[PDB]
Design a protein around this ligand. Sequence first.
Ligand SMILES: [Ca+2]
Ligand SMILES: [Ca+2]
Ligand SMILES: [Cl-]
Ligand SMILES: [Cl-]
Ligand code: NA
Ligand code: NA
Ligand code: NA
Ligand code: NA
Ligand code: NA
Ligand code: NA
Ligand code: NA
Ligand code: NA
Ligand code: NA
Ligand code: NA
Lengths: 234, 234, 6, 6
Amino acid sequence: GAMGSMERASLIQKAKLAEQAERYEDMAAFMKGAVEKGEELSCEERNLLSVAYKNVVGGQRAAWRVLSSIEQKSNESEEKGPEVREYREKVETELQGVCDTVLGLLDSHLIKEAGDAESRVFYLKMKGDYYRYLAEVATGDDKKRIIDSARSAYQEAMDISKKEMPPTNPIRLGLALNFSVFHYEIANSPEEAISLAKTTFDEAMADLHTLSEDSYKDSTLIMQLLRDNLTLWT
Amino acid sequence: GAMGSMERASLIQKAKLAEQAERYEDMAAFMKGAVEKGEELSCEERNLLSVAYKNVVGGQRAAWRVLSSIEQKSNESEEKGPEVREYREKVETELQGVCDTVLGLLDSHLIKEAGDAESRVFYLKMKGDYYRYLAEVATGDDKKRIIDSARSAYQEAMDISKKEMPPTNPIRLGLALNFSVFHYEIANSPEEAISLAKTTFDEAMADLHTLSEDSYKDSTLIMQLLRDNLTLWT
Amino acid sequence: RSKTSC
Amino acid sequence: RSKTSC
Ligand SMILES: [Ca+2]
Ligand SMILES: [Ca+2]
Ligand SMILES: [Cl-]
Ligand SMILES: [Cl-]
Ligand code: NA
Ligand code: NA
Ligand code: NA
Ligand code: NA
Ligand code: NA
Ligand code: NA
Ligand code: NA
Ligand code: NA
Ligand code: NA
Ligand code: NA
């Protein structure tokens, strides 16, 4: 790896600088380098890893959707050759590579070394997320296996989070948010999506009274995202 | 070049797709490939080239400014090691490489083949712009030579534009806008900057009566940028 | 678009 | 910031 010669602490420092500069590809490469040092990640470091790759793949997903839309309309229309498909495939391949890179870090060896609920649920949610992004562009022999890999990762994260975390825990809340979107957008299960979002929201609401002002603000922010989706879906 | 096997028309088509997807690095590489086919560029193609690299270097410049600010404050303050300087240098080197790439395309062989005023002024303005971006990060033996290269390119573009184009021509207007910013920001000549912006604005104002509604809208848009700068500078 | 975690 | 051509 090109980051093999840089100190772990320097990689983390530069990841934070890249975030300030909105240089998310750099941020991701720095955090990949930090993971490959082989030590477990702190809570702050896990969030840096997640922020970096979320922004990178977020840009690719947005680009893929633009190009897929153009491609779909070309198939309704004058023939303009292979270029739209070719370029959509280029972006798609780059997106799949980023997802594969993240899943590779989780499998070698973040998940197996993660024993606390807060780290294990975090990494399993990430595994579900990046299989979900693969599922968004999948159209082949393994779309179903990709979907089941996302579901399986989310399900394991859910089981742990329900046993080990309070209903207002932001990681638990963000996991349930994303699993409900998986149900609605990927798994063709809108009723499951709605049920999970409601139940998650209501159980968090009943636990808010236990929280500090600052934790209350953290939890209600994510609860509002559940509410926004319920309003869109119903 | 990795674009050597792709048709010129396909590169142009994909540049337009990348723009729609906000994939400006891809856009720039496609347009670099198109230039290297060796044929002159149409007006629309010149604008694609300019849009692509402007967005790429624009992101690098914004990142460089964030990091330079952090570096300047570190030099006022607890010692945190070489990482800020190192990463600022990384971004700086990548920015200089993009500028060098653009200047290389202009020198091999866009400018020498450009005979019409609209193309020659366009390319010379671009040469001034990318030397100006080099000047923004220069701090060495050749900061002065870089500044004089920007000035010389802008000056040649100005001389042609005044002889060959009307005062409302958007290329002429955008050239004068950027040369005035060169004077204010790079050359420590705010009075020259103000004089050029005013004169440019006033001469365009007196020529608006000759224009269609659509050309009037094109010219007044750029005249407003001159006005915005005069308001900031005075 | 459905919202996912920030 | 001074504005340059779009
Ligand atoms: Ca452990
Ligand atoms: Ca010619
Ligand atoms: Cl392509
Ligand atoms: Cl670096
Ligand atoms: Na070390
Ligand atoms: Na370890
Ligand atoms: Na075509
Ligand atoms: Na617990
Ligand atoms: Na509704
Ligand atoms: Na050809
Ligand atoms: Na030629
Ligand atoms: Na340090
Ligand atoms: Na003329
Ligand atoms: Na003023």
